Design a protein around this ligand. Structure first.
Ligand SMILES: NC(=O)c1ccc[n+]([C@@H]2O[C@H](COP(=O)([O-])OP(=O)(O)OC[C@H]3O[C@@H](n4cnc5c(N)ncnc54)[C@H](O)[C@@H]3O)[C@@H](O)[C@H]2O)c1
Ligand SMILES: NC(=O)c1ccc[n+]([C@@H]2O[C@H](COP(=O)([O-])OP(=O)(O)OC[C@H]3O[C@@H](n4cnc5c(N)ncnc54)[C@H](O)[C@@H]3O)[C@@H](O)[C@H]2O)c1
Ligand SMILES: [Mg+2]
Ligand SMILES: [Mg+2]
Lengths: 387, 387
């Protein structure tokens, strides 16, 4: 309900407050939380610069940095209007994985300016969560900061998406008894989230993925790919298929839509392979209803909806992703760490309890952050990507 | 004690944590602190951009922004090493004036870069507290951001200093029965804090102030003034005196030192006017001890020391300054608002209870933030500098 939301925000002027982690009411402790006390850790950090991580909030602090240019489904609406979302993201870090988070909203659509600016304010952050930025812009920024900064940088709306998606896919294949190295996938929308699902599947040795945009699939020599679309045309659609979604969906095991509402029909689901897997994650109106999906013959349907039986939820991955990432002092959130965050999530469900309505856990299950963290941590230490 | 400080910081990995201002454990409230709830204030702010201030932390949030280039008496030691100080400053905003504060430490010594960068991250802050930056650099940045941003910007180490100083001066004059429009002041150190005390006194119609640096006083045609020193040479030292501190101190009513340790003697205090006022605020070793100050003949001595009878303390002004500033929705922290913050502070002491050891209140007295706020607020509304 609208009014219920608005009231909530108005109620306390925001969701995000700061507390003191130590106590101070007099002059004694004052000279320790401030001068001349504060001088002593400052000189420590000056001597050994890594000592930031023991006299400071840094190592439990994740920055939630944004642009405003892609806010939920509201798109480019600016830094002010995105603020409530960023505040909301911060307190979820806090409530789900006991993480201190703070929102920074940046007023610039220039990649290089945003890169530089975030890189210059990294002192206080133990990790960066990038949120609600425009594809393709979000990629170069993520990539630029990732090779620039010595702390973990992570675009949740694309990499966090793929973790839950790949989790739900792996679980769904066990159901219909198929293996992901044998199956032909179609992803509608070559934007941020489409892009990254493609990556996380190729990361999983998918047999073949085809990306489709609002104009047709993407193949070598397509008119106008953005720079990341181009790099992805190389790895995807091996058999070099061309044409519209209607034509291309024909014969596929998995449809994954992150694009639009109601662009897929029941007829279209009938053309897909037996035991079809349909993921209609467009929001709020998915590209097809599970009703019309099961009518076409879909064995499994996931959506981005809470009311519907199989919810792809972003709060499944990011709290546990950052938890182990921080818990490990990881300098980086690598691909293998993503890969490990997927399996851990897919394994909350026992394998004895898998259904066509039990491919993903509940988004609040405390055992999700715990296991995703342990696996994200376990590989960080192993691989070396650790302070 | 050192170890006691270091332990304190280590104890909890920093002084600054974040809380949620609203509750959320399930899915119900989740869809209000996040999607689809957060959409509703976001669209409000998009429609009326001022609505930031009712669905968001902004209007109770002050940013503590720094460089590292002037940390206490540690000077240029970088963004990492300054972090504990900035964290300490944030929780004092919180504990003294119930204000949410967050530390941003900037890794750049380029004025224009720092201006731009802070201006670009202003979305989340209701006010800016600039902290621990190099004179003269701090001035152009303060000035640039002050004319650029629509929120209050405030360099505490200079303007906050002057408020307490001017407060202690006005109170001290009542003691020795002198008026500030008749008296001849000398300030040692034409750095940030010296500079700004000069301003706040000229703001008070001082008869004559003389600034002195590590090389001699400042007069028209002095070899190498920085740009702000130059502007101040015009308003100060009317009688155009030249020479060293020894020579120049001779005959003055007030000495105010913000420079060095032990550069003033008892002999030198004997040359000043009757009922001398001596302010040795250099830290930790003041430019003269009260013992040697009263030996020279000082009627009144203030220092920056807690053990000594008259402490100039920065935590006297800034919590109450920002309180009323925020309490008023001030768009600006103007000169008249500074002026009003001074008088309010000087008037915590009854005027029936003034001593040579009672010119300033206690730095924890809750009635200080309250009154400084009401006066800072009262003039904001009057003058118009208000949303
Ligand atoms: N957990 C989840 O449920 C979850 C996570 C991420 C995204 N999503 C949903 O997926 C959708 C995409 O989100 P995003 O972050 O990738 O946004 P995005 O704008 O980056 O992706 C959209 C892309 O799809 C393409 N597209 C648009 N309309 C199309 C059409 N009719 N046919 C084919 N292609 C089309 C466009 O090229 C665009 O670049 C959103 O509606 C969002 O709600 C859901
Ligand atoms: N509330 C307080 O007690 C309070 C507040 C602010 C500053 N201070 C003290 O005052 C001092 C100055 O602080 P600041 O922020 O202005 O630092 P600053 O470096 O900006 O000011 C120092 C300036 O004094 C000049 N100087 C240095 N040594 C000198 C000497 N021997 N003779 C004459 N001039 C000299 C230099 O030109 C320099 O620019 C510090 O030691 C600080 O502890 C105290
Ligand atoms: Mg988002
Ligand atoms: Mg300071």
């Amino acid at each position: 309900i609208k009014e219920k939301a608005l009231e909530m925000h108005e109620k306390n002027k925001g969701k995000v407050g700061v507390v003191s982690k130590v106590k101070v009411q007099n002059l004694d402790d004052l000279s320790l939380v401030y001068t001349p006390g504060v001088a002593e850790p400052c000189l420590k950090i000056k001597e050994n610069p890594s000592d930031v991580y023991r006299y400071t909030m840094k190592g439990n602090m994740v920055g939630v940095i944004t642009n405003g240019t892609a806010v939920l489904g509201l798109g480019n609406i600016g830094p002010k209007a995105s603020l409530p979302v960023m505040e909301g993201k911060a307190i979820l870090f806090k409530e789900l994985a006991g993480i201190d988070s703070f929102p920074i909203c940046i007023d610039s659509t220039d990649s290089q300016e945003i890169v530089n600016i975030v890189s210059k304010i990294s002192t206080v952050f133990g990790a960066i969560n990038l949120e609600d930025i425009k594809s393709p812009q979000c990629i170069e920024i993520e990539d630029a900061l990732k090779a620039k900064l010595d702390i973990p940088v992570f675009h949740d709306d694309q990499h966090g998406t793929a973790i839950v998606v790949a989790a739900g896919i792996l679980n769904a294949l066990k159901v219909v008894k198929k293996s992901i190295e044998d199956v032909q996938v179609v992803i509608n929308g070559a934007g941020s989230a489409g892009m990254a699902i493609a990556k996380m599947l190729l990361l999983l040795k998918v047999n073949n993925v085809v990306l489709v945009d609002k104009t047709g699939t993407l193949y070598k020599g397509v008119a106008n790919l953005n720079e990341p679309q181009k790099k992805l045309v190389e790895v995807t659609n091996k058999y070099q298929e061309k044409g519209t979604l209607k034509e291309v969906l024909k014969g596929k095991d998995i449809f994954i839509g992150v694009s639009a509402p109601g662009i897929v029909t029941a007829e279209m689901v009938a053309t897909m392979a037996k035991d079809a897997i349909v993921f209609a994650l467009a929001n709020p109106v998915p590209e097809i209803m599970p009703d019309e999906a099961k009518k076409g013959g879909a064995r499994i349907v996931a959506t981005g909806r809470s009311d519907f039986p199989n919810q792809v939820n972003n709060c499944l991955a990011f709290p546990g992703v950052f938890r182990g990432t921080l818990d490990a002092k990881a300098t980086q959130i690598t691909e293998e760490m993503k890969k490990a965050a997927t399996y851990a999530l897919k394994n909350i469900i026992k394998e004895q309890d898998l259904n066509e309505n039990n491919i993903l856990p509940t988004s609040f299950n405390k055992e999700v952050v715990k296991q995703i963290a342990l696996a994200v941590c376990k590989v960080a230490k192993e691989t070396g990507v650790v302070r």
